[PDB]
């Protein structure tokens, strides 16, 4: 009894551990009860139980600080017991660790220890190492003396002493600033998938020998540079405890013929001697490029050598080889054969949430001013990867150091601790860093869960429900689809006038479903068509298969037909290279992958009709121009970004804009805003948009869909019945 599996925690606090309620009932404890955790090598820690709705019943969630003191790792099991006997301490002696007290001097108690305990009522245990962050530095402290033993709660009325030289770290404990899983921001799902593959073979090697199951031996990671491929490989080795050996293409290739092969073999021999071990091969496409693409004897031979060593992993017990490449199709296909590198994880580019998480991670030690808004930065940093956001945070910190602390600094190797602790980084310093940074991955497609919700779309209430029936019902009610022999649709095409919200509809359903949204825009379909590179369609669909659950949206499906002349063009048909590859991939995609494909076109009369056949976008939804009540809803939604006076009659405007699309109502909202801004500026050479600004905007705004086009759109929808 009372044995729980060690897992990760969300709350980074050095004293909180979370349990699922069924285990809180078996231990006869409640929220806030003090418990003791017993680990390995006669070590224990004292913590406060909280509860949540995310911990598994058999697991206990704790942060790195607790795991390090218990000398346990993720996947291990610890013993937990209540200890309601604890009362507040009297005197404690806490000293810093030398490893972190570098480049700094001053009253470390007032800077770090006093905040960390002040009205915090923290449990501590003799010998515990805890981390206090601040002043752009993460400083850890050891408890060396306590009047009560072995543990107590540090209360505001206790005496905290701190005198003596910094303590040298012991060999039985690891530095709390070493790369771990809590240093990785976006791509949390990918990290979870890797943990499932590596945590058990390495932490419990006896299990895979005793049970007839084969472990993964090779994991291929890929994505743009600066996304965390190397960061993961290092974090995994540090978290599991496996010996880490680094290999990189350029270094192996820099060696002479015969030396490159010998050195590559030695790396595998060292991993075996120190097993369990993880080998990380960076730039896999450089060390082992496609043989049929290289004329050099050395580049062709090194591929054979790596393939042999990878196969030898059946004899080299407990060795896992991870590799990183920029593109999964730039490596010799032999490496991807069963065995060797048979498992792959697409890291890709951090999404809007991940970018915020990365900014939060690289600011852990930074004191941010009240005006700092990292979510706003994450939304502006489009095309940035972890390497760029890390540089952004470092530049923001550096400018704050120049503005303030550089006036205060010594002609000496060490800063006053109080100076750094009082150094706050303002929004202006983050904005400056943003202007200096340049995204390293702006062209590659970014796949993420969209932030568009149903409340952002005016009108079309019935269409919103239709998408739910096409996307949610097949998996929310699978017993009804099986009972009635229903075949779920693989996708839907939206057709009708432009500017009615087709794009938002596809995003909104992806958002509610918590599914990744893949945005393929007209220019991307045109790029493949113009350059005769339709092969890239397979990579797009591969993203949908690996990103599942996801919604794969192909916008402006008629962009090629229009780029071919649209109304006239040549004498050919609607089929072309890009759409043909799309049709092929759709036929090879099963609904069991939880991928739903949505198309949109504003010229359905020139779309390849094959896309509407069973097995493709067989469902058709007509999206008309919004009606009067919908146009008002659109105007109200678009004006949520600006002050608007109460005199503005949005219903009157909607009555006039009878032939306007939603995109045209946006122009009216923006045009009236522009007038309000211009008048406000001129008044100093006003506080809100006035009725006169909307009535003036109506004098220039026009409908983008003519009466001739409205009838064409309606007659087409009528023909389809």
């Amino acid at each position: 009894p009372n044995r729980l599996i060690v897992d990760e925690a969300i709350n980074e606090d050095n004293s909180v551990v979370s349990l699922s309620q069924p285990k809180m009932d078996e231990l006869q404890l409640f929220r806030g009860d003090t418990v003791l955790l017993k680990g390995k090598k006669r070590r224990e820690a004292v913590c406060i139980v909280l509860s949540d709705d995310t911990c598994s019943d058999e697991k206990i969630r704790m942060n790195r600080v607790v795991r390090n003191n218990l000398r346990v790792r993720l996947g291990d099991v610890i013993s937990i017991q209540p200890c309601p006997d604890v009362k507040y301490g009297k005197r404690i002696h806490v000293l810093p660790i030398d490893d972190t007290v570098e480049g700094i001097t001053g009253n470390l108690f007032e800077v770090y220890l006093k905040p960390y305990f002040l009205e915090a009522y923290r449990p501590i245990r003799k010998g515990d190492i805890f981390l206090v962050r601040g002043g752009m530095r993460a400083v850890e402290f050891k408890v060396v003396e306590t009047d009560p033993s072995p543990y107590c709660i540090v209360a505001p009325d206790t005496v905290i002493h701190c005198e003596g030289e910094p303590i040298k770290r012991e060999d039985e404990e690891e530095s709390l600033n070493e790369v771990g899983y809590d240093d990785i921001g976006g791509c949390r799902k990918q990290l979870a998938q890797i943990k499932e593959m590596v945590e058990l073979p390495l932490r419990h090697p006896a299990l895979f020998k005793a049970i007839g199951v084969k472990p993964p031996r090779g994991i291929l990671l890929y994505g743009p540079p600066g996304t965390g491929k190397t960061l993961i490989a290092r974090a995994v080795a540090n978290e599991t405890g496996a010996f880490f050996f680094l290999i990189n293409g350029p270094e192996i290739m820099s060696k002479l013929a015969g030396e490159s092969e010998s050195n590559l073999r030695k790396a595998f021999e060292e991993a075996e001697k120190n097993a369990p071990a993880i080998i990380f091969i960076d730039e896999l496409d450089a060390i082992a490029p496609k043989r049929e693409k290289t004329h050099g004897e050395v580049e062709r031979r090194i591929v054979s050598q790596l393939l042999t060593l990878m196969d030898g992993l059946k004899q080299r017990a407990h060795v896992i080889v991870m590799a990183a490449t920029n593109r999964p199709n730039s490596i010799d296909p032999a490496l991807r054969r069963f065995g060797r590198f048979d498992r792959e994880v697409d890291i890709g580019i951090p999404d809007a949430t991940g970018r915020l998480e990365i900014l939060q991670i690289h600011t852990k030690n930074m004191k941010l001013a009240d005006d700092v808004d990292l979510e706003q930065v994450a939304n502006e940093t489009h095309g940035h990867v972890g390497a760029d956001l890390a540089a952004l945070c470092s530049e923001a910190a550096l400018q704050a150091i120049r503005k303030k602390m550089d006036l205060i600094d010594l002609e000496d190797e060490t800063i006053d601790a109080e100076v750094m602790n009082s150094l706050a980084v303002t929004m202006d310093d983050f904005r400056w860093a943003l202007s200096q940074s340049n995204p390293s991955a702006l062209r590659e497609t970014v796949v993420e869960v969209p932030q568009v919700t149903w409340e952002d779309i005016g009108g079309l209430e019935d269409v919103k429900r239709e998408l739910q029936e096409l996307v949610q019902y097949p998996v929310e009610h699978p017993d009804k689809f099986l009972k009635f022999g229903m075949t779920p649709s693989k996708g839907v095409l939206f057709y009708g006038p432009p500017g009615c919200g087709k794009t938002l509809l596809a995003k909104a359903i992806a958002n509610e479903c918590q599914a990744n949204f893949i945005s393929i825009k007209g220019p991307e379909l045109l790029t493949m068509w113009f350059g005769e590179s339709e092969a890239n369609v397979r990579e797009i669909f591969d993203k949908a298969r690996q990103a599942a659950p996801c919604v794969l949206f192909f916008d402006e499906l008629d962009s090629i037909a229009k780029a071919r002349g649209g109304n006239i063009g040549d004498g050919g048909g609607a089929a072309d290279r890009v759409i043909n590859q799309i049709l092929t991939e759709m036929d090879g995609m099963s609904t069991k992958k939880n991928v739903f494909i949505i198309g949109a076109t504003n010229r359905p009369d020139i779309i390849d009709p094959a896309i509407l056949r069973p097995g493709r976008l067989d469902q058709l939804i007509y999206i008309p121009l919004p009606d009067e009540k919908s146009r008002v809803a659109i105007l109200k939604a678009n004006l949520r970004k600006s002050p608007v006076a109460k005199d503005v009659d949005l219903e009157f405007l909607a009555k006039m804009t009878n032939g306007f699309s939603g995109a045209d109502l946006t122009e009216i909202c923006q045009r009236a805003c522009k007038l309000a801004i211009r008048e406000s500026i001129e008044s100093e050479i006003v506080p809100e948009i006035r009725r006169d600004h909307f009535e003036e905007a109506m004098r220039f705004a026009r409908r983008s869909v003519s009466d001739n086009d409205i009838r064409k759109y309606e007659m087409f929808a009528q023909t389809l019945q």
């Binding site: 709350n11 909180v16 806030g32 406060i48 604890v86 009522y121 923290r122």
Partner: peptide, 20 residues
């Protein structure tokens, strides 16, 4: 018991502030 409920109150406050 009510003495350690003060550490609970501090922990719960730390957590719910960090939700901001």
């Amino acid at each position: 018991t009510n003495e350690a409920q003060m550490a609970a109150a501090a922990a719960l406050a730390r957590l719910e502030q960090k939700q901001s």
